[PDB]
């Protein structure tokens, strides 16, 4: 009568993590600092853009005043 | 060229120009001219919106000038940096700087060594940083 039986206990492994706490807060300052640069790209290149749109019409001026002026010489020379 | 632009307040175009020719000072071994022009150009970029994040780049390059000096003067150079501009001691450059100081105290080369190709393994370095790295573990 040396029949014997037994019972099971079980264990958890632990979960995925304890490589998640280093690289992780990093990455997050990382990933701040681009945040903060590319706000700081984004002002600066809605400033350049306006000040190329600024640019145009002085252009546009200058070319049509002398367009104007070269016509008007022309015309009392001859 | 650098002073003609800083003449007309030029400020970018003349830094660059004080970058190369610091640079090339380092490259023929002229430290003090080198270390003045990176501290100079830090010293202007800490007080930027956008070029303060590099303000921490110059300055290594000058502390490592100091290393082909002497020891005790890049301890004390790296000290006067770190309390100018707090936020460098957080940087990856002062504590690669402090392990070699460390292992460079005592006679240790393995150290220096394992550092050294830790930091290569994150970021390659340059011919001008290796050679500088080189010439430092050659003095001892």
Not at chain 2, 108 to 120: A, C, G, I, L
Request: charged letters at 35%; aromatic letters at 8%; proline letters at 1%.
């Amino acid at each position: 009568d040396m029949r014997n039986e037994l019972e099971e206990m079980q264990r958890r492994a632990d979960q995925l993590a304890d490589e998640s706490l280093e690289s992780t807060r990093r990455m997050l300052q990382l990933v701040e600092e681009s945040k903060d640069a590319g706000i700081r790209t984004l002002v600066m290149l809605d400033e350049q853009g306006e000040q190329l749109e600024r640019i145009e019409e002085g252009m546009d001026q200058i070319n049509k005043d002398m367009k104007e002026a070269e016509k008007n010489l022309t015309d009392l020379g001859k | 060229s650098a002073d003609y632009y800083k003449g007309e307040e030029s400020n970018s175009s003349a830094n660059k120009c004080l970058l190369k020719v610091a640079g090339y000072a380092a490259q023929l071994e002229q430290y003090q001219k080198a270390i003045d022009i990176y501290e100079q150009v830090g010293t202007s970029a800490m007080d930027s919106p956008l070029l303060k994040y590099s303000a921490k780049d110059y300055f290594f390059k000058a502390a490592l000038c100091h290393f082909c000096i002497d020891m005790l003067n890049a301890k004390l150079a790296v000290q006067k940096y770190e309390e100018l501009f707090p936020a460098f001691s957080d940087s990856r450059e002062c504590k690669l700087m402090k392990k070699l100081l460390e292992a460079h105290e005592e006679q240790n080369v393995d150290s220096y060594t394992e550092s050294v190709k830790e930091y290569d393994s994150i970021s390659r370095l340059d011919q001008w940083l290796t050679t500088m790295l080189l010439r430092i573990k050659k003095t001892i």
